[PDB]
Every structure is written in C-alpha cells, then in structure tokens.
Ligand binder design. Structure first.
Ligand code: IUM
Ligand code: IUM
Ligand code: IUM
Ligand code: IUM
Ligand code: IUM
Ligand code: IUM
Ligand code: IUM
Ligand code: NA
Ligand code: NA
Lengths: 347, 413
C-alpha cells in the first residue's frame, strides 16, 4: 500500500488516499511515532510499503532541504505544451504566454469561456512532452460531474472538493495537497498544480475563517486570504532544487461582488497570465484567448531570440486590428500548419 | 402515479409471486381470475375484512435497529398507520433508510396492533447486490427528457430547444414573483409523465400554504410530498431528507428519478432556522453553515455511470425584497448545469410562458441535442440578441403556435 502522510497533533500519523481526495477513511494506513520518527519525515510525504505498515520501501518514490528554505529562482526551463496541431490553445500558449517550471500562472476566466478545456489541454501537453513531471489538478467547489470528466481524460492527479463538501474539509484537502507538492519539490521533482480556482479557494477560506478582519467588503473578511495568497505564492523554481508550477484560475464577470473582489486582491500577482475573452466566447470563437493581454515575465528566459521577435511582430499587428480579427487570422494560419515550427517559418 | 404503480409493481411480478400474495391474502379463486382482475382484488384487500393486505412505504431505520415504513400518503410523517419492520428483516434483506418496501401486511390484531410486515415482496419495486449512491460515478446526462407534448404547451417546446433537461440534470428555474413558475413545474412533470412513464416523479413542496398544495395535488400527476405550512421546521427538513434518501435508493436500483423542488430557496431558509448557530453570518442573516445542507441536496442530482439518474429541477426565488433570499441565490451560483430563467418584466405584461431565452441554457447540451438542432437553435439565439425580450419571445411564440411540432418548427428555419 501507499498514501499521503498526515502527522496528528500528538505524534502518530495516517496515510491519506488520493482516491479519497485525501480525506480521512478506513482504509487509511497507520504509522509509528516513532516511524516517523527517524525515518524523520513530515506531512505531505508519500509512503509505500507492505501492509498497518510492516515497513517502508519508499518515501516519495525513493528509498533534503526544507521547502521554505530552498533558494527561489526564476523559471529557466520551458514547458512545451504543443502536441497535436489542432489543439490551438497550447500552440498559442507556447508562443504568447509560455509557461516554465516554477511558473506562477493565472488564467483569467469569465463565465463559459472554455476555462476547463484549456486546463485539461495544459495538463495533457505536460503529460506528453514531460512525462517525469508530476501533474496535480485540484478542484475546489467543483461540480461532481466535472470531476469525473476531468479525471478520465487527463493524467492526472485529480483531487476534488466539490461544492457540496463541508467547507472545513474542502480546506484540508487543499492544504494537504499543497504540502504534498512542497514535499515533492524537496525531493527534486518538477510539480504542477492546476488549480480551479483561486476565487473559490478564497471563498471557502472566507466561510471557514473566524471572523475578526479589518471590516468586510465581500462581505469578505480580509483574513481570507491569506492563505490562498500563500497558496499561489508557493509557486517557484529552486536552486537546490525542483519546481512548483501553479496555474490557477481567477474568475471574472460572474456578477458577484464577492468574487470581484477577490479578483481585485489577486489582480496582477502572477508572473504568467492567460486572459480569456467573454466577447470572443460569446462569439463563439475558441480558444477564446485575448493574446494582447496574455503574457509572461521574463520570456527570453523561455523563448529563443528568433521566436521572440516574430511573436513581437504578431503582437504589433494584432494590436492594430480587432480582437476577432485577432485571431481568426492567427487561428487560420494555425489553422494551415502542422506545427508552430512551420507556422513560424511563414513569418 | 401513486398508485400508481402499485398496479405497476404487481404487473411486473411473475405469476408465481403474484400467486403467493393472493394466497396469503386469501383471495377466493385467484387462479381463475384474469391477471388484471387479480391485481385489483389484491389491492382491494386493504379496505375489506381480511386483515392481510398488500402495502408499501418507505423505511426509516431507527437507531435501535428496527424500522417503520413511512407513507407517501401522509407526506412521511408519523402514524400508525406506519408499518413495523423488524431487525431480522433489516438485517436479512440488508435494507437501508429510504428503501421502498412492499409486501403482505398484517393489520392491527387485538391481537398485536400495530401493522406488521409479515412478508416482503419487493424492495424499491424490484422483486427481492447494492452499490451505494455515493460510490457511483457522477456524470453528465446522456439521454434527454423529451418534454414536448401538446403543440400549444409552449413552455416545454422552448425548454426542449433552448434549455434541454436530461436524465441526471441539476436544473434551476429562476423565478421572480409571479412568475408562472408553478405551471412550469406542472408542465415539466407532465411531459415527463407522458413521454417517459418509467421515470419516478416526485414533487417536493417545502413549507407552503395548503391551497397552493392542493392544487397542484390535483393537478399533477406525480407523487406529491409536501409537509405543510404549519409543521415544525425540523420536521420539514426530515421530510425532505427522507424524500432524497428514497430517490437515492431508487437510483441505486437503476431507476430514473425526478424531484421537482418548489423551492430551494425555502428549503434553504428552513435549514437556517434549524441548524446549530455557527457564530458567523453573513448577512443574511444567514449562516454558513449551512447552506451546506441544501447544497448537498441539490448536489445529489446526477447521472451516474453504473446506475440510474437523479434529476432535480429546483425553483430559485429571485427579486423578492430579501435579502436572505438574495444571499442564497448568490451562494448557489455555478452549482447547477441547467437554467430556465423567467422574466419579471414579461410576467407583468401577461406573456406566458415568461421565459428569458437568451439567459436560459444547459451545459454540455451537445450530449442532449443533435448537431442540426444545435446550430438552428444557435441562429435563433443570434436573432434573439437583435431584439427585446418581449419581441423575441413574442416572435417565437408566434412561430410555435403556427406549427404542429418542434421538428415541424425547425423544418422552417
Ligand atoms: O481506496 U479508500 O477510504
Ligand atoms: O472540460 U468539461 O463539462
Ligand atoms: O467582454 U471582452 O475581449
Ligand atoms: O523580462 U527582461 O532584460
Ligand atoms: O399488462 U396486465 O394483467
Ligand atoms: O369481469 U372484468 O375488466
Ligand atoms: O396512508 U395514512 O395515517
Ligand atoms: Na464556466
Ligand atoms: Na456586480
């Protein structure tokens, strides 16, 4: 058996089932005090061995500096998301808003603009081009049926806290999820969390947090929130080293001050942004990406000089036409090309 | 539908079983009887003088491990005449709260008086295993309800086109006051009854006035559970919860169930008077807290991959003056996967059905409508965006009233 450690207040611990969304259960495993204890291991850690655990054969897939200590650095190795020529979303991302290991990405998403499809495509791109990366998809407040759709169909560690889970439990799934990923980076892995979404993560933390803040506006107690910020802020590359990429959605144009608000508190805190367009979605042009508002710092770290200059030109012409003319033009050329490579040859 | 069924359960039984029941009941000459006749006699026993009849109700298993069958007729809802179920039965048949148990029942004897279930004949309508509702794989609906019946019943023609409901839908009828929401429910209940007679239809009326219930009753048909303006709120929650549990047992046994919930808003309000204060809120003044409870309710709706489906179409009361109502509509945003939005403005002008089409839709409708119909609905939408509201709905109603069917209507596009 195997699972995700959960050191209890005394000193003993259980292993959580991913297939349980990391929630408590029998059959959860049991673990010494004491083993721990040396062994020397903390929460988030993944244990496997014979079972009730007679003994441990691997912690995190292996028989170590601490996360907060690791030296943070800019992302320096790109994710190549492009696979099949018809998946336009990832072809565009690789050009206009590349994502690297350690990226702190925001997908800005108005209602019904294909946010979930893009997530799955990003997830599948990394699975194909970067099989050794560990992929996690955390869904907070998700509709139950969207879970099974995302899970089959990507790969793919999908942990979910659906809108009918009790709030304090929704939170524990999120935090344990983060701890597990931090543990893995410590062990030199490249890790990705696709988070749908920060908005709802936020809202969950609102309901459950107690209740002292500097006055509401949500009604939202600044205390949030934290801790969602601390979640998103955890993304980083490291010297010593391993990366945590976080691509998280931020909801917009949903009609909620909550919500707004919320968005306001996150607006601009990413170092990679992919904005989705309602007008382009109503339109009904997909992927509904607003390329002009999308991008990443400091992208010559990710794009070679040749590519970057061409994308710059695409930008200037494009900034000189409507969004739909976009887009459209770019989607056509894409469109007619069996790779971004070839597409680039034509500039 | 009661009823209902009842005839329905007996029809599905092989002769051997029907014969065992008829004997138990001491029907004179049951072999000579035409089946349908035998079934009427079996039902008629209740109200004669034999003290064995054929009955059913829905299991509440008590902490001590014995149970009673609550009765739909009493909205579920304590009596005698409830039917006692022993621990032996619960254990041997592996029964659960919510199960519909049918059988030969001994009447109060003087004797032993209570009603006793002396012989169990069906569980959830299936002759005499179970995966739990919670372990089934939730999924999008993949089969549609066809609601359209009579060509002049416009609400359903529009729903079928603009906001299709399928088996497993979590649907929300957004209803400002008056409205016309009650009639929508009735017409939905109805289309499903004519076009899909095997679906179990439950209308759950939360804390509403008697007349409204009647009505309605009345009215339908469908199992109608309402329990009633003047009962304590923790009693009301209990009605709704047992109703839900029963639906879940049905799905476990592969039925397609529909609950038409009037309304979620009021369900929400009840859980507020009822749930141990959380110390936070809100406001409101509404918890929290839940909330989590009405959310679980609505959220139970789903198609499942390994069993039946639970469709929940719930009214959501909007533009009321509160407030606490508002907060709840807020808290339920993005939970559903189907929306039928009704217009306050189009209501005051006497245009029914008062539907705002452009704002109404259903997610993953490609699973429910063929490509042709989708693109044709799409243009209808384009043209609708080019006018009111009043004018769009009006044009469309007009084109509908000119046609014998929706497929007719689409031939025109
Ligand atoms: O595989 U489990 O509680
Ligand atoms: O990727 U989807 O209902
Ligand atoms: O609602 U706009 O690119
Ligand atoms: O993103 U710079 O020299
Ligand atoms: O269908 U006959 O007695
Ligand atoms: O005797 U004759 O239905
Ligand atoms: O079915 U009576 O009291
Ligand atoms: Na959406
Ligand atoms: Na607003």
């Amino acid at each position: 058996g195997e699972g995700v450690l959960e050191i209890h207040p005394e000193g003993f611990g259980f292993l959580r089932r991913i297939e349980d969304n990391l929630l408590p259960s029998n059959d959860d495993i049991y673990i010494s005090p004491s083993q721990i204890r040396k062994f020397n291991l903390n929460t988030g850690d993944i244990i496997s061995g014979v079972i009730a655990m007679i003994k441990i054969e691997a912690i995190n897939y292996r028989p170590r500096v601490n996360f907060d200590n690791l030296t943070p650095d800019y992302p320096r190795e790109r994710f190549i998301l492009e696979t099949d020529p018809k998946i336009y979303s990832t072809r565009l991302i690789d050009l206009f808003a590349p994502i690297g290991k350690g990226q702190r990405g925001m997908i800005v998403a108005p209602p019904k603009a294909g946010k979930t499809t893009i997530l799955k495509e990003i997830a599948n791109g990394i699975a194909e081009n970067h099989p050794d990366t560990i992929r996690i998809i955390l869904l907070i407040d998700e509709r139950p049926e969207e879970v099974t759709d995302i899970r089959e169909s990507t790969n793919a560690i999908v942990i979910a806290a659906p809108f009918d889970m009790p709030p304090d439990k929704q939170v524990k799934v999120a935090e344990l999820t983060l701890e597990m990923a931090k543990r893995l980076v410590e062990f030199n892995y490249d890790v990705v969390i696709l988070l749908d979404s920060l908005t709802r993560l936020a809202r969950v933390y609102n309901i459950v947090v107690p209740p002292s803040g500097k006055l509401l506006t949500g009604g939202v107690d600044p205390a949030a929130l934290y801790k969602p910020k601390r979640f998103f802020g955890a993304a980083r590359n490291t010297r010593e080293g391993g990366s945590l990429t976080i691509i998280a959605t931020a909801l917009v144009e949903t009609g909620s001050k909550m919500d707004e608000v919320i968005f306001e508190e996150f607006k601009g805190t990413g170092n990679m942004e992919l904005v989705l367009s309602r007008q382009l979605a109503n339109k009904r042009i997909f992927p509904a990406i607003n390329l002009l508002l999308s991008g990443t710092r400091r992208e010559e770290l990710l794009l070679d000089e040749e590519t970057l200059k061409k994308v710059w030109l695409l930008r200037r012409m494009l900034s000189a036409m409507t969004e739909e003319e976009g887009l459209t033009l770019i989607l056509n050329k894409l469109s007619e090309t069996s790779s971004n490579e070839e597409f680039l040859k034509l500039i």
